[PDB]
Structures are given as structure tokens and as C-alpha cells.
Symmetry: C4
Subunit: 332 residues, 4 copies
């Protein structure tokens, strides 16, 4: 594999069509799914030359701990759909690569088992029927050693996935929600913040004032995201709001972005627009489907090479330097 | 049916080619027909998160009465072209869905029969040979219980529909103007306003100063519209003038928009740009052609689901909240 | 024929490939040829409603005389290439339609014969080897009753027409320059202006300061034009400079435009951007090739219908009103 | 050959696929390779008319010597890959055309042999393992009569060429680096500047502040360049930074540009945006592959004709006049 696109082709060959569609699809007409890619393709980096690259490092510190790259594995539900080892294979490869792994509320292996793999597990929360149940899930994650609560804030309910409807897609009987919903509000965020010492990261912020309010609410970070184009069809890509959001928060929390990251060059674009780090979703599942744990390992080593390559070619010895790069919008 | 596009495919299968062309076509090169879709596809919504959605409602008040959605059925002439029950089937489904139905001057069933269906009938007016005849038609509509006069202001004459010319399209002998023209002016608007207590709504406004003059003329509303790309080929899409027009009228009348609305997400875009409500034309006729009254019912229930879905995903418990959403233009 | 595109298809059927290529082609990569069309397709008109259309007229006064439309036939060389009657057929149809006809310096019938047809002949000048010969040609045109000198200013030499090179295209022996070159300068313009009482119109102006200098030089008009994309490959379309040029000349001369006018809607766009009138080139030759004089007659009657249709739909009872229309750029 | 594209077609026919791919390819997804062309295609020139063209000249003075065109042959490694005579054939044709030729550090014929051809040889430098070796290479070039040191500053290491990886491309045993690396810094630039009296030209500058720093560092010129899209995938095209860079340097050094120059019209665009001269890479190799020295001669004579044609059509008797042309961005 020399690009992430090699992995998509491999995953399409192996997966049943309806499972590939569950993974690949978005809501509605898939306008936001496509726009995530269009937006990145419009961004061009203005690289710097002739800087000291004797000690190029892709490492960052985030939520109190080092990560080997400015990247984490995005929460993706039901990973046993893609490979029999599911979440354990992905978490093992992420741990070995020094990349945080986001455990899902809807994981097909229990959060305690995934956390036992080690590494830097984060936990993604969906708000449950009642506050007590929701906070018990947060407590389980904390007790198991998860290092951040990634509270998904863009799913009052799941969006309308037309591929799944047309396929009549249902979970196989051999895939379950191994950890076992009502719309979250700012009051829910406060309940979580008051119930944990872990950083709370709000995933799915797109409006500038919601980013500001996230800081005021005590969030340790946000993920600027349209949920991979799976929620509101027509929601702006996170990458298009990122610069405005970074300016408005003015360092008050970590600002991550996701949606359509498909190369180290895309990571560089995200950092040049101001992101602290990115999440990567579908490509990790392509690698899992294609070759299990070893596939994910190969994907992460390819991304690490691409990130180092892009940073050095752009004159950046550190991720902080990459955040100071300028960009110019073009046409594609 | 999981999208409005399912209905177009069904209607193309059943309708004779020349009738499908009468419905689908625009004037000239169809530049304005295509631009109605292009314009909507360029708009992206910036959704809000974490708001109270316990009582999400898609209802609005317009022209003194509640509507179940921020939408009405646009005036489309000669509905018996598409199904034997024609206007009665559409009006029955609209009534049952709580959506206003616009009766045409060129309806293939008399306006009194359509009004007798019940619901919230509006009446669309074309200006006739002389003021007296025009005002008699307005009086008939009022006597029959129509709740608004939708005065079409963009048809001094009908545009040049090249599909119809190439097809030699003519009305079948079994379709007639069951209610049975000169260019309307501002004097005609005043004659109507002085002759009825019903709200007068000017359909086909695109220039900002025409919207302002509409308010000054006593209009209760306007429809910002290029007539579905059927009138001036090269006329700007209504959606592209909507924001400027909403600012200029500053609440002095209701501001509706039409042209290319094909999903609840498109309704959300229109409201985020400032519209009070939208009209929907061709998709209603697709549903009528595909399955008569039940087809229209299914279309309206699908649109209701899509509107509720889009509003909630965007953090809007009411249409008023949706009007306060921000947007960002993208590339497609 | 219901559109000008019908005529292109007819002309392609009848003409030898190398002659069609001589007519259709541009210089270099044909970037400016294509851009003439792209530019018009990006312009949208903001029509006005409810205005008095009792006496809609497409007539204008230009260079002292009435024209039936805001249009003239552009100078196109060697019209016998397209039909045996060549320039006489086109001039007869133009006369009958009330449209000025531009006689070429490189006409395949003598300018005196074409002028004898009557109508409103203009004469297009290429600067010749020496001032004396050039001025004799101007004097011939004036003596024959031509009403304006259209001095082509964008041909210091002919551009590089790759279709013609690849075809090895040469004039047939039966086509000659029946009136029988050095680069023109501002001194040449002054020599012409001092030698005739006819209005001098500079064809091929694109730079704002060249338009201003044209007024200062005593020109009665300019044609904002990239020569149909046949001269500098990469020259901006005239339609894209028109608004800036109209503002800079501030009524000091007539401002015409050409390049890619293919419908009455395109004429409306040009006038809304500020043009006094347009020239039309290739479509007139398509009509000539397809059906001789009667073909040109049909083209001009179609254009007249389209211009009247577009003006009325846009609320314009006169061309002056159309010049006051606003426009909005879109995407295509 | 009537366009540079004729030469690409000829080269694709003759070269082995993997060698054509080495020449044609870029890094990553080839976004920057494509953008070099997209950017030029968006630029339109505003030509001037009626200027004195009695003595049109395409000559410039650069680095102390006359050149026949505002163009030089870009450094392209291993020219024996494309033709048995390799660099000698290209240098001979460049000399005969009056165009400077850039000798590569990775040339397949020694720099002394290429310099012995005569003409105006420049020397492109890659920074070597240590300062002493690097400066010895500079000294060799100076001793051999090279007239400028083109220090490549955008290659801390070579980019990731996916075509080469997928082809498993390797140099044939019959091609070697006949002159026989560590990342260059500003200290390396200073070491070169202090070690030679020749002008030092920094190739691969894209950031405005790097252009300013180049002037402050004593560079005699810069090449605004993304290395033909072969280095950072996603780097902005040089043509898009050129105007801003020309303004910032305010005549303090020569400002060249490269990337996607494919015609004399493209040369005109580059000069109108402010470039002193362009480099041309791939097309020179197409000509070499197609027909050796005579092929390169034909390419350079075609480019000379196209440059003269474009300049005159735009009203420019000199390259300085072309730099004063204005431009307008369009859509393609
Ligand atoms: C099959 C699938 C399931 C989930 C389940 C979740 C989830 O239970 N909670 C959550 O908070 N985000 C989810 N996501 C979104 C994900 O976390 C990233 O937001 C996007 O995948 C980023 O885009 P790509 O990198 O995929 O473009 C999913 C994405 C995909 C494709
Ligand atoms: C076949 C057909 C007949 C009519 C007859 C009328 C009419 O006698 N009076 C009027 O005032 N508007 C009409 N219209 C325009 C319509 O009311 C809406 O303006 C558009 O259809 C909105 O666009 P879509 O929702 O269709 O894109 C029509 C549209 C179509 C397609
Ligand atoms: C075959 C052909 C010959 C000529 C000869 C001349 C000419 O001896 N003098 C002149 O001054 N302009 C010419 N022109 C340009 C023409 O007058 C109009 O500028 C464009 O044709 C407008 O574009 P379309 O309406 O054609 O797009 C020509 C255009 C075409 C196609
Ligand atoms: C096969 C190939 C080898 C080299 C080797 C070098 C090099 O050892 N040093 C350097 O400094 N630039 C190089 N280049 C870039 C070149 O000098 C021009 O920057 C681009 O080719 C301009 O774009 P095109 O005119 O090619 O679009 C190369 C370009 C190509 C295609
Ligand atoms: Mg991503
Ligand atoms: Mg609509
Ligand atoms: Mg024209
Ligand atoms: Mg180049």
C-alpha cells in the first residue's frame, strides 16, 4: 500500500456490499460526504524552505499525554462488521503506533476489553435514556483507564442513511452492542463535566458560537466535524469552519477536525488551518477489513511516513510549526 | 420512496414523453432550470448542537392559519395531464397533510370543486383581458373559501418552452381550463388589493426593489421565484436573491421562495436563508403521476420526515430557529 | 429552427469540414473561444416585474440611424466560402430585418456591390500597407453609402489558427478578396478620423484605458471584443470587461460587445451589462450555409423574437430599460 | 509540430511507460501537478491595442547576459533516460536558440562536457553531505563557465512519486550521475553566496517571506515553483504566488516562475503576472525524446514564434511592456 486509496480498493473487494455501504455512506444525497473531500482538495499549502529539519518530529501532547502523530482513530461503531477481531485489532495497532484509539459506546467488544489492550484509549459517549445511566458509562470508561470522554453532540438521533434503507441493512446476529438514547443538551455536558476529572471533548461542533460555548462549558477540546457526512445532509464540512473556530477559541481548548482525511498531506492541511490533531475514520476500517491488525498497522505506518514527508517538505520540524503555515484556496 | 428522486423516476416511467417534458422543461437553454438546483447545492448549513428538542415542531402560521410544514403546493396548471383525478387528488392529500394547496387559474377542475375538498386552498391568479373579468375570478376564489390570492407577476406572456415546441405539444381534448390574458402591472395589483380582504401574494419577484415595492403596495407576501426556470431563461434563481430580499423587506411581508426544492434539507436551506416557507411544484406532480392521491400523501409524509430530521439535526425546535441558522457557500 | 443551435447543426451537416473549421475555430488552445461562452453562461439577469409593456420596442438609434434590434452582423471574411451568394445573401436578409451589416475589407464580393443592396451597411477596415491605400478604401466605403467605419484594432497580424494549420486550409480558387497589410496604431486611427465624417468604431478593445483613449481619439464607438477567440489565445472575453469599460467611458461613445452571442437572452445579458448593441458572427454564417438568404432571414426573425421575449419577461419596454437591469454572477 | 501538445503525444509513443511516468508524474495524488495547469488556465490577459510594433523583441537581459526569449530550460535530471545524446542534445539546441540551459547536479553527462557545448549554461545545485563537497561542485561549475548557481531549495529530500513506486522504477545501468545529500538551510545559501561571484538563484520559493528573505540573503534571483508538483503534494502553484511575491521583492532580485508553461501564451501570462522569465521542464524532454537535438530545436522555435505572436497581439514590443499588462481571473 502506497496510499490510503489502495486500502479502500482492498476493502471493497472483501466486504459484503451492504457492509461496505454502511461504512462508506452518508445521509440524504451525500452532499456533505462529498463536500468533505471537495473542501480538502481546494486547500493548498504555502510551504516554507531552508529551515532546520535535523530533528523533525510528528509528536504532539494532547490531553496530558504524548501521541506519535497529530491523529487519533475516530469512533466507528460495530467494528466486528469489518473483521472478526474488530475493535481489538484496531486498538492493538493504534497502541503499537502511538496513536490514541476512540472506544465507541456502540462497540462490538466491551470497552473494558478494548481498554485492556493498553495504549491511549479515549471513550466516545452517546447520551443515554437518563443521566444516571449515561454517567455510569462515563464512570466505567474512567475506571478502565480511558483518558478522555469524547461526547458526541451531533446525534440527537441518527441521520437518514439511504444506502442502508435501500439495502435493508441490519446488524448480523453475531454483532452486538457489547457495552449493553436521548438527545444531549448543554445540561448533559455539564453533568458529564461535573462527574469526571477526564477532559471532555465535544465531537460534532460546527458553529463558531458553539465552539465558544464549549470552552465556556469547560470542554477540554472539540472536534469540528459533520460526522463524516452521516448526520445533517448539507452540513458544512468541518475543515471549512476550522479557521474561524480556531480564531474564536483562541487557545481555550484543543481544536480537532475530522472528515475526509485521506493522506499525510491532508493532515498537514488540517494543521495549517489550525487543528491540534485530526481524527481518521473510514480508512482505518478499510485497513481492518483488508488485513486485520496488520492492515491497520500498515495504514498507520503509511500515514506516519506521509505526515513526516509533508511536514519536512513544508519546512516544519514540529506540528506547532505546521500550524503556523499559511494556505491559499484554489479550484479543482 | 426514500427520496423525492425516487418519485421522479417513477413518474418518468408512467407519463408519455411529451407530458413529462411539459412538466420537466424550462425556457430557452434551461439555464435557469439547472441553476435552481446548482444554487441550492452550493448552500451549506451551519447546524447548532445541544439545544432542547423535546417539542420539535415544523408548524408555522401564515396568512392567518396554521400549516403543518413551512411549505405549500405550488400552482401547476392542468393537473389532469398527470393523473385522471388531477387537482382533486393533490388537494385531498395536501389537506390531509396540513399543507396549503394553490389552485391554478388554469386548473383542469373548477376552483369551486377543488375548494370543496377543504384544507387550506389558496388561489393563483393570472391577469385576464380586462379588470372586471380578473376581479370576478378573485371574487369566485374568495366566495369559495380560498385564503390567499397568489398573483403571478412574472408572466406578461408565457416563456418559450423549446421541449414543447419540438414535441408539438398540445393539450389533449380531455383536458381543459375548467375555470372558463393581458400583462399585469402595479395598477393591476392595486385593483386586486382594493377588491379583496384576502392577503395578496406576488409570485415571481426577483429584484430587491420589486420586493420593497410589493410591501409598499400592500402585499401580504411575495414568492421569490424564477417560475421554475420556465419564464426568462437566464433569470437568477430565487434562492440567490432571497437573503437580500429578506433584509430589504425587514418583516413587512411574508417572503416565500420556490424553485428546485427537492428535500427537507432544501427546505432547511431556504429557511436558513430567511424564507417564511417554500413552494414545491414538480415533485408533487411526480407523486401524482406515480400513484395519484396516495402518491402525493407519501411524498408529503416523506417531506415532513425530512424537514423534521433536518431541523432537529440542525438544533432547531421551530421554524423560527431555523431562520436564525447561518449558511456558508461551497463548491459542487 | 427554434434556437441558434439548430442552425449550427444544420451548417455542420452541409459545409466541408475544413470550411466549418475555418468558421468555428479560434487561436491556440481555443481558451478564449470557449471563455466567450463560459462568461455569458455565468451571467444571470435580475428581471423586473409589473411594468408597462404596451409598446415594447427592440429598436435603437446608433450612428445616426434606427436599427430594428440592438444588433449588427459582425464582419466575417470570405462569405462565399459558406454559400454561393455569400455577402449578398447576408446583406439582403440584414436589410430586410432592419439590422446593420458590416462589409469586410476581405469580402468575397466587392464593397460597392454589397452596399448597393441597400439597408444600413457599415464598413470594416484593416489597415493596409500605406496610409494612402488605407484611406482610399475608407473613401470607397463612404462614397458607396456606408454609414460607419469599423476599424479592426486587434489584428496587427492574424492569430495562429491551429485547425487551419492542421487542415492545410487554403481559399478555393473561386473565392477571392474582391475589394483588391500593416499593423494599425493610434496614428492610423487619427488618419482615418481626419479623412472621414463617418463615425469611426474601434473593434477589438479590451483594456479600460484603451476604451478611454478611444473616446479621447474621437471614436464614435468601440466594440469590446476578443475577435471571437481568434486573435490572442488567453485574451479576456469582451463580456467580462464590458461593465468596467461602460463605466469608464461614461457615455462618451457607443459601447458594443461581441463574442458568443447565441440567443436573445444573451443580447439581454449584454445590454444589462451596459452594451449599446452586440455583433453576431458565426451564427449568421451558420444560417447562410444552411439555407442562404432565407436562412439568414429565419435566424434574424428568431433572434428578434427571442430579444422581444427576453426584454418583456425582464420588464423592459425599451433597450434603454434593459441597460438599467442588474445582473448577478453564478456558477455553471 | 504546431503546439507543445504535439510533442507530448510523440514522446508518449516512443518512451517506455515507466520512463514516461518518471517524467510526467508528480508526488502523492498529483494535486499540485494538475493545479499548475489549472492555475494558468484561469488567468486571462487584458491585451493592449494600437501600439508601435515595428521592433518587437522577445529578448531580455538576465544575470548579466542577453537571452533570446524570457525562458530557460529547467533542470531535469538524467536526460539520457529520454534520448542517447541526453543533455548534450538539449544544451546544443538551447545554445543555438539563445536560451539558457540549466545543468543538473544529477546530469547523466558531466557538467564540464555540457558546459563545453557553449551557450549560456547555468548550474543547478543540490546540497551535498557536507559544505566542502557542495562548494567544490559550485567551484567546478564556475570554473567551467556556468553563469548562475540555481540552488534548489525545495528538496530536503525527494517527494513520494507513486507512479515510480508502482512501476518499481530504477535507473538503467546505462544511466548514471555523471558528476560523481543533506537538507539545505539558510546557512547553506550563505556558504554558497560567500564562495562564488556568480548570481545565486533560489529555486522552489513559494512563501512571500521566503522571497523577501532570499533578497536579504543576497540572492540574485528566485524561481517561484512547486517543483512541477513533484515535491509537496498540495503545495500552491508558483503562478498563484507570483504576483504577491513580485510586489514584496519590489525589484530586489529577478523573479522567475515555472510549472506547467506549455505555450507562448503561458509565457505571456507569467510575464503579465510579473515574472522576469520562466523555466520550461517537461516539454523540453518531450522534444528530446521525440527527435533528439532537432526536436528540441523545433520546440524552441515554436515557443519563440508563440511568444512573439502573443506579445504582439497583446500590444507589447518588449518583455518589459508585457510585465505591465493586466490580467483577470476567469473560470474553466
Ligand atoms: C460507519 C461509521 C460509524 C460511525 C459511528 C460513530 C459513532 O458511533 N459516534 C461518533 O461520534 N461518530 C461515529 N462515526 C463518525 C466518525 O467518528 C468520524 O466523524 C467520521 O468517520 C470522520 O470521517 P472519515 O475520516 O470517516 O471521513 C461513524 C462513522 C462511520 C463511517
Ligand atoms: C408544468 C408547470 C406548470 C406551471 C404553471 C404555473 C402557473 O399556471 N402559474 C404560476 O404562477 N406558476 C406555474 N408554475 C410554476 C410553479 O408554481 C413553481 O414556481 C415552480 O414549479 C417551482 O419550481 P419546482 O418546485 O417546480 O422546481 C408551473 C410550473 C410547472 C412545472
Ligand atoms: C471566420 C471568421 C472571420 C472573421 C473575419 C473578421 C475580419 O475580417 N475582421 C474583423 O474585424 N473580425 C473578423 N471576425 C470576427 C468577428 O467580427 C466577430 O468579432 C466574432 O465572430 C464575434 O464572435 P461570434 O459572434 O462569432 O462569437 C471573423 C470571425 C470569424 C469567425
Ligand atoms: C523528471 C524531472 C526531473 C527533475 C529534476 C530536478 C532536479 O534535479 N532539480 C530541480 O531543481 N528540479 C528538477 N525538476 C523540476 C524542474 O526543474 C521544473 O521545476 C519543473 O519540471 C517545472 O515544471 P514543467 O515545466 O515540468 O511543468 C525535475 C522535473 C522533472 C519532471
Ligand atoms: Mg477524517
Ligand atoms: Mg421548489
Ligand atoms: Mg457575438
Ligand atoms: Mg514550466
Amino acid at each position: 500500500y502506497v496510499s490510503l486509496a489502495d486500502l479502500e480498493r482492498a476493502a471493497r473487494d472483501v466486504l459484503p456490499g451492504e457492509i461496505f455501504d454502511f461504512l462508506a455512506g452518508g445521509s440524504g444525497t451525500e452532499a456533505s460526504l462529498v463536500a468533505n473531500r471537495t473542501a480538502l482538495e481546494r486547500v493548498f499549502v504555502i510551504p516554507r524552505m531552508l529551515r532546520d529539519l535535523t530533528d523533525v518530529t510528528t509528536e504532539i501532547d494532547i490531553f496530558g499525554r504524548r501521541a506519535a502523530l497529530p491523529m487519533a482513530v475516530a469512533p466507528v461503531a460495530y467494528q466486528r462488521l469489518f473483521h472478526p477481531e474488530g475493535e481489538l485489532a484496531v486498538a492493538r495497532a493504534a497502541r503499537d503506533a502511538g496513536v490514541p484509539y476512540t472506544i465507541c459506546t456502540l462497540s462490538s467488544v466491551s470497552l473494558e476489553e478494548i481498554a485492556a489492550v493498553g495504549g491511549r484509549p479515549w471513550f466516545q459517549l452517546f447520551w443515554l435514556r437518563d443521566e444516571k445511566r449515561s454517567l455510569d458509562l462515563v464512570r466505567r470508561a474512567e475506571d478502565a483507564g480511558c483518558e478522555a470522554i469524547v461526547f458526541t453532540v451531533d446525534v440527537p438521533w441518527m441521520g437518514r442513511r439511504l444506502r442502508d434503507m435501500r439495502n435493508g441493512f441490519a446488524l448480523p446476529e453475531w454483532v452486538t452492542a457489547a457495552n449493553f438514547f436521548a438527545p444531549a443538551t448543554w445540561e448533559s455536558v455539564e453533568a458529564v463535566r461535573a462527574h469526571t476529572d477526564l477532559p471532555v471533548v465535544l465531537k460534532g461542533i460546527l458553529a463558531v458560537e458553539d465552539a465558544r460555548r464549549a470552552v465556556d462549558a469547560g470542554a477540554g477540546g472539540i472536534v469540528v466535524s459533520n460526522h463524516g457526512g452521516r448526520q445533517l445532509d448539507g452540513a458544512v464540512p468541518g475543515i471549512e469552519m476550522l479557521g474561524e473556530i480556531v480564531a474564536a477559541v483562541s487557545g481555550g481548548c484543543e481544536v480537532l477536525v475530522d472528515g475526509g482525511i485521506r493522506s499525510g498531506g491532508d493532515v498537514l492541511k488540517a494543521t495549517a488551518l489550525g487543528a491540534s490533531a485530526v481524527l481518521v475514520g473510514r480508512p482505518v476500517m478499510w485497513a481492518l477489513a483488508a488485513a486485520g491488525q496488520d492492515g491497520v498497522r500498515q495504514l498507520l505506518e503509511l500515514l506516519a511516513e506521509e505526515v513526516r514527508d509533508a511536514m519536512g517538505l513544508a519546512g516544519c520540524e514540529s506540528v506547532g510549526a505546521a500550524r503556523r503555515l499559511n494556505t491559499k484556496l484554489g479550484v479543482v
